[PDB]
């Protein structure tokens, strides 16, 4: 065909090629940000006065700020509507409201994220004296 | 971006040739044994992930080939 | 499509495929470094003057320098903030601070690592004369 | 368009087509040479005088001469700066420098290649008499 | 692009695609031939004159001709340099050279193959009169 | 090439694209319908007059109407040529023809489907009075 | 006209001989890796397209053969 045709066709063809190529790039860049929580240490602590609190250590898998939806441990679910972001790996403290336990038992649990991934606990109970007054709380 | 902590690069952010490069992580507090993933976000759009584990070491190396200073 | 399009698409798909392939390589290389401690011999020793010390033999499982976080034996926890690295398999000596025992008892134990893994003891007590003056101390 | 135009365009078009096609061929030929090490048998041997040495059997996966970077067994790393090429499948002998073990233990390890891929061991210890004097050494 | 270009590119792409597809077929056909030995019955027999021999029953798992490398029973290793092929499931007789045992003991062991897989024994000793004169010997 | 060529080639290429794409869709839709049976409760009941019957609870895994081929309990096989479809989760009653048992024994079994998947039982025996007259029979 | 940004040329806009020429782009803000096209609109009516990629460099060259100053 006349070079006018090749001009038109190459213009449209190049536009489409660039669009699809950088579509592939953007798809890869979005799939690379798949994230989720993982736990490495969890031991429910109980005070003498009945106050209990979970002292867990989280590590975000991926490159993102995971959002925690709720903590379900020993059948008691606990919603989280504030400070529910895990900004960096560290040791975090979650207060359990009304779960009444006794030293020695073994309780499992889950951390349900906003995306859908979860994480189990297999955490035991250990006796302690006082509730720690520090930062890094997850559901207040 | 590694383990949820993003670190911008505004100087010496060019890769001139294949080699071994050293990047300082600012405030990530980790412990020996953990497994961390990550990404290198380029300026064009392509990326590259990490899935790098942690290993114990003694001293920060004093050498060239730094990527984000 | 036009060879211009095939050039662009092949370049981008090659970049993406190489990235993902070496991502898989790095995942395998990182999962191959999973490590942990294991014990092969442990007998708590007691001196005539009341000094107690555990004479354990460790073997690092994996290819890494594991980090010992704390030693919990017979309910008494002992923190470790110096020389808490196990560099090679061998016999190591840990001083117990205030555990008061008597010859013949059978004590349990656990070595809590930093990564999460642990190791039990089932170590008994045996009489001894003097605290050994040697290297390979784990928590000083 | 005029046959002059079709002549010019077909010339340039054919050059580009041949370039891209043999680019695809060369990319395939380079991807076909992806290689890596694999182990089929490994049993650390120990002599009566304390000398230890690994007697492993390697098989290069792929069609290439893989390069061994370092051997890490039980937390002890060993660099390899000479004879670090695996030329053909066979039985190879690696000397471990200072690892002090005892008959019966179970040790794991890794072979870190130059490209990035690895290969683990989980090799047990067995008693032997003398260090073998033969070829096929990997890190001297 | 011109259909000359599509001809060139389709030829090259079809060659590459057929190559990779039948590569997948050959890889599957090779991975389907993974084999190994398994035991279902083993009782070390002893004669009145001190001759001992193992009367084992082998079944090759897979579809291949496994190669027996060595038989290690009760710490005594026995090399096999002839008739070391297992042709079909059946009862096989292996002579033990110098193992001196007594009726009632319990001995374990391994059958070390050439590929790497093994198989345990957990075989007891039972009294017998004469060494059987039959075929199906494994290490002569 | 002339736009006539691009017209022809784009027509054929688009036809092939649509065909292969919706082939992928249909393959996914067919693989998503993979189904199989699973059991959650089974206790073989026995009457005083010798009539035995299994009172099992089935749950179809997947989204389909599985077909039961045969029930094999304690070595006795029982073909099923009618009402052999599991329409919904629920409690079902299977009559055993001639199996003679006694209260206290522990029997295993299988439910062999038409597709190939199976399901074990690990079902004990418990004494009962009368055969239940109800629907939800599986092999009549 | 490159990447939608048009740039007029009112001085030294003549091409005297085949060679390598340098044109300054005023305000186009790009990033390394992108692919930009363009056109050179002549006075007679004919044009010429670019499809030119971006590459990193250090300093603006101080030389002759400028086309739009």
């Amino acid at each position: 065909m006349t070079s006018l045709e090749i001009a038109i066709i190459v213009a449209i063809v190049l536009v489409i090629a660039i669009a699809v190529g950088w579509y592939l790039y953007t798809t890869f860049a979005a799939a690379g940000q798949q994230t989720g929580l993982t736990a490495t240490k969890a031991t429910i602590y109980v005070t003498k006065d009945g106050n209990v609190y979970l002292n867990v250590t989280l590590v975000p898998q991926g490159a993102a700020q995971v959002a925690i939806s709720s903590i379900e441990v020993a059948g008691v679910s606990i919603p989280c509507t504030s400070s529910n972001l895990v900004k960096a790996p560290g040791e975090y403290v979650i207060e359990l409201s009304s779960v009444s336990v006794s030293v020695g038992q073994v309780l499992t649990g889950r951390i349900v994220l906003a995306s859908g991934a979860i994480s189990p606990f297999t955490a035991t109970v250990v006796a302690a004296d006082h509730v720690p007054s520090t930062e890094n709380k997850l559901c207040s």
Side-chain angles (χ1 to χ4, degrees), chain A:
Chain A
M1 48 193 203
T2 305
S3 280
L4 283 305
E5 296 219 50
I6 289 179
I8 304 180
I9 286 308
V10 164
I12 294 181
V13 154
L14 184 70
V15 162
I16 289 182
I18 289 307
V20 170
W22 296 89
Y23 175 42
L24 281 184
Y25 270 165
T26 319
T27 297
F28 186 53
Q33 279 184 28
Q34 213 43 65
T35 183
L37 266 190
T38 199
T40 42
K41 205 169 304 176
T43 44
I44 297 186
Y45 284 179
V46 55
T47 59
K48 296 193 326 297
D49 302 331
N51 274 330
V52 300
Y53 63 92
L54 169 54
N55 187 295
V56 75
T57 289
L58 308 189
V59 166
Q61 285 292 336
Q65 322 275 13
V66 284
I68 288 185
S69 159
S70 87
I71 315 297
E72 294 169 348
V73 50
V76 164
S77 72
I78 294 195
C80 302
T81 42
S82 87
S83 297
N84 64 335
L85 278 183
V86 185
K87 276 298 177 184
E91 166 182 331
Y92 294 76
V93 169
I94 310 181
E95 270 145 9
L96 297 198
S97 72
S98 44
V99 185
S100 84
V101 305
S102 42
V103 176
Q105 291 159 329
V106 171
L107 302 169
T108 73
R110 286 191 323 157
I111 300 183
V112 168
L113 306 177
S115 88
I118 66 169
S119 64
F121 277 164
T122 299
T124 184
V125 193
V126 174
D129 45 22
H130 67 283
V131 175
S133 45
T134 190
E135 330 301 329
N136 293 318
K137 294 201 178 187
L138 280 195
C139 306
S140 160

